Structure formats: structure tokens, C-alpha cells
Amino acid sequence: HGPISPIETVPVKLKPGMDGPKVKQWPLTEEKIKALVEICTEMEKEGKISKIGPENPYNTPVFAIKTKWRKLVDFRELNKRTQDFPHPAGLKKKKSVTVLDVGDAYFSVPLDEDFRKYTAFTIPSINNETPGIRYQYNVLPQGWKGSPAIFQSSMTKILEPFKKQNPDIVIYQYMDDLYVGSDLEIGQHRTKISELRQHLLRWGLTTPDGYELHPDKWTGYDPSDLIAEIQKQGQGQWTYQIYQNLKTGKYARMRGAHTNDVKQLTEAVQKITTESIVIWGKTPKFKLPIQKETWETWWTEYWQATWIPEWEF
Numbered sequence: 285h286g287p288i289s290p291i292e293t294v295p296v297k298l299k300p301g302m303d304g305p306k307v308k309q310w311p312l313t314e315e316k317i318k319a320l321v322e323i324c325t326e327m328e329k330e331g332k333i334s335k336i337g338p339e340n341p342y343n344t345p346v347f348a349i350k351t352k353w354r355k356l357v358d359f360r361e362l363n364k365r366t367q368d369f370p371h372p373a374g375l376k377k378k379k380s381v382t383v384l385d386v387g388d389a390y391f392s393v394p395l396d397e398d399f400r401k402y403t404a405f406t407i408p409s410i411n412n413e414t415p416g417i418r419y420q421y422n423v424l425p426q427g428w429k430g431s432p433a434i435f436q437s438s439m440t441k442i443l444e445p446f447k448k449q450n451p452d453i454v455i456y457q458y459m460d461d462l463y464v465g466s467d468l469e470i471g472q473h474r475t476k477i478s479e480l481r482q483h484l485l486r487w488g489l490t491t492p493d494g495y496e497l498h499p500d501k502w503t504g505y506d507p508s509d510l511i512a513e514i515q516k517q518g519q520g521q522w523t524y525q526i527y528q529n530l531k532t533g534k535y536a537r538m539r540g541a542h543t544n545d546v547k548q549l550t551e552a553v554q555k556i557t558t559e560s561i562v563i564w565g566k567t568p569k570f571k572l573p574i575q576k577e578t579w580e581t582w583w584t585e586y587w588q589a590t591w592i593p594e595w596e597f
């Protein structure tokens with residue numbers, strides 16, 4: 285991950301009269317702690333985070349998810365506290381839409397030195413019995429709402445040659461993802477995705493393989509909040525409603541040695557969100573058919589998105 289440019293540092297503020305977040309770190313398995321220690325040691329060596337002293341009172345929770353492990357930060361409270369900074373109706377009509385995570389970009393952009401204290405986090409000790417290892421970010425963090433806002437002018441400059449050369453392709457950005465849609469034959473669409481990823485890479489932006497959607501095959505919206513309600517429909521399936529119904533659907537509810545309701549609900553939350561972004565450009569608030577304590581206990585075991593939505597129970 286390349287070096288940062290000090291002149292790209294952008295001042296950023298909390299909302300007036302709000303202090304930084306102090307959300308405690310929940311306990312992690314020793315396997316997850318080891319993984320985070322390894323990740324954070326590398327980030328620190330590369331200047332992306334720094335160990336902090338005893339004066340800093342803020343905290344944002346972190347966890348680890350998977351072959352390899354990735355660090356996930358729950359910035360929901362910092363996001364609420366951070367200052368504030370069009371959706372194509374045709375995206376859902378495209379033969380293919382590939383979702384590309386472009387959050388790697390953020391490691392190459394500095395965070396306002398005065399704001400870094402609000403990104404503090406702790407790698408926990410085993411059982412949270414002794415003080416953890418405290419760090420803060422020096423670069424735009426993934427999951428923070430300021431990061432895509434601050435990176436937007438560079439993202440635009442980077443994408444411009446691709447968009448100019450491909451008027452048949454729609455590119456929509458939402459949070460840290462690009463949604464790249466076309467009506468090309470799947471092989472030709474995939475070639476365009478590869479050209480895009482190679483262009484990003486040329487400018488220092490690595491991407492994982494993208495996720496492919498085919499929304500033209502999917503089954504009154506007020507742009508002025510989306511609610512997604514999932515309910516148990518007996519022993520064997522899930523139903524859901526999206527309303528402000530705008531959409532309803534179903535998923536299988538399976539029992540087995542490698543699944544459970546929390547795992548299935550995290551999957552359905554991700555899929556409903558992705559579909560809602562494609563169709564309307566908005567992330568729903570969720571109502572989940574599970575007890576808070578059970579959810580709060582296990583959702584991070586299976587969560588795969590970089591983003592984390594709001595949910596009630």
C-alpha cells in the first residue's frame with residue numbers, strides 16, 4: 285500500500301455539540317485476537333494505524349471475519365456523530381451488474397490529524413480480563429462514512445477514461461462499492477469488468493473479484509426511509525417485506541450442522557440490502573425475527589459486508 289500525500293488531508297469535524305464515540309470492545313476468541321494482532325502489526329508498520337497513549341478515551345469496536353481473515357470495524361456510532369458532507373433507475377434493468385469493493389483506495393489517503401483520536405479502537409485481551417492494545421487510524425478507514433465522500437474527487441478522476449470509453453455501461457457508487465451494469469453478453473460484460481479492475485490497479489486501487497447480479501431477472505417509492513421486515517414462516521422458510529409493500533420475497537430456512545438462524549439472517553440482510561441499493565439506492569432499516577441478545581451475540585460470526593445497517597428486534 286503506497287505512501288500518502290500530505291496535501292490530500294481534508295479537515296473533518298464531528299457534528300456540533302457531539303463528542304466522539306465510546307462503544308466498548310466485546311470479547312473475541314483467541315483465534316480472532318491473533319488474527320487482528322497480525323493485521324494490525326502490518327498496518328502499523330505501513331503507517332496506516334498508530335498505537336495511542338493512555339489519554340485517549342474513545343472507542344469503536346472491531347472484529348475479525350474470514351482462508352484469510354479481514355478486520356471489520358463497527359463505525360456506526362462514529363458515523364452518527366460525524367458531520368454530513370443520483371441513483372439510475374435503469375440499473376435494475378441491466379442484464380448484469382457487478383459489485384466491486386473499492387475500499388482498498390482509502391489506505392492511501394491521510395485522515396485529518398485532529399480527527400484521528402475519534403477512530404480509536406482496542407484489540408481485546410483474552411476474555412477482556414486485562415487492558416487491550418489501543419490504536420487509532422492515520423488514513424481514511426473503511427466503514428467510516430467520511431471515507432467515500434473524501435475520496436470522491438479522486439475516484440471520479442480515476443473512472444473518467446473508463447466511463448468516456450464505455451457509454452453503454454452504467455457505474456453507480458454506493459458506500460464503498462461500485463455497481464457496474466450493462467446489457468452486454470456475459471463474456472463481454474466480464475471483459476469490461478476486467479478492464480476496469482486493471483485500470484483501478486494501475487492507479488493503485490486493488491479490488492477483489494466482484495459479485496455478479498442479474499437484476500433484469502428479479503421478480504410507489506418515496507425518495508424522501510426503507511424498512512425491511514423478515515419473519516419466520518414456519519420451520520422451512522423466511523419471508524420478507526420491504527416497505528415505507530414495495531417488494532416481498534422468500535428465502536429457505538434450513539437446519540443443519542453448519543447453519544443456524546443468525547447465519548441465514550445475516551445472509552438475507554446482505555442480499556436484501558444489495559437488492560435495495562440496486563433498485564432504489566437506499567439501505568433499509570431491518571426488523572429481524574430474533575431476540576436482541578441472540579443476534580447481538582452471534583451476528584459478527586458470519587457478517588461479510590464492510591457496512592453494517594441498523595436493525596431492531
Ligand SMILES: Oc1cc(O)c2c(c1)Oc1cc(O)cc(O)c1C2
Nearest residue numbers: 285323326327330332353354355391
Ligand atoms: O482487513 C485487512 C486484512 C489484512 O490482512 C490487511 C489489512 C486489512 O490492511 C493492511 C494494510 C496495509 O497497509 C498492509 C497490510 O498488509 C494489510 C493487511
Ligand SMILES: Oc1cc(O)c2c(c1)Oc1cc(O)cc(O)c1C2
Nearest residue numbers: 426427428429432459460590591592
Ligand atoms: O462501509 C461503509 C459503512 C457505512 O455505514 C457507510 C459507508 C460505508 O459509506 C457511506 C457513504 C455516505 O456518503 C453516507 C453514509 O451514511 C455512508 C455509511
Ligand SMILES: O=[N+]([O-])c1cc([N+](=O)[O-])c(O)c([N+](=O)[O-])c1
Nearest residue numbers: 307308309341342343406415416
Ligand atoms: O473496550 N474499550 O472501550 C476500551 C476503552 C479503553 N479506553 O481507554 O477508552 C481502553 O483502555 C480499553 N482497554 O484498554 O481494554 C478498552
Ligand SMILES: O=[N+]([O-])c1cc([N+](=O)[O-])c(O)c([N+](=O)[O-])c1
Nearest residue numbers: 308309408409412413414415416
Ligand atoms: O481488552 N479489552 O477490550 C477490554 C475491554 C474491557 N471492556 O469492559 O470493554 C475491559 O474492561 C477490559 N479490562 O478490564 O481489562 C479490557
Ligand SMILES: O=[N+]([O-])c1cc([N+](=O)[O-])c(O)c([N+](=O)[O-])c1
Nearest residue numbers: 308309340341343413414415416
Ligand atoms: O483498563 N481497562 O481495561 C479500561 C477499560 C475501559 N473500557 O471502557 O473498557 C476503559 O474505558 C478504560 N479507560 O478509559 O481507562 C480502561
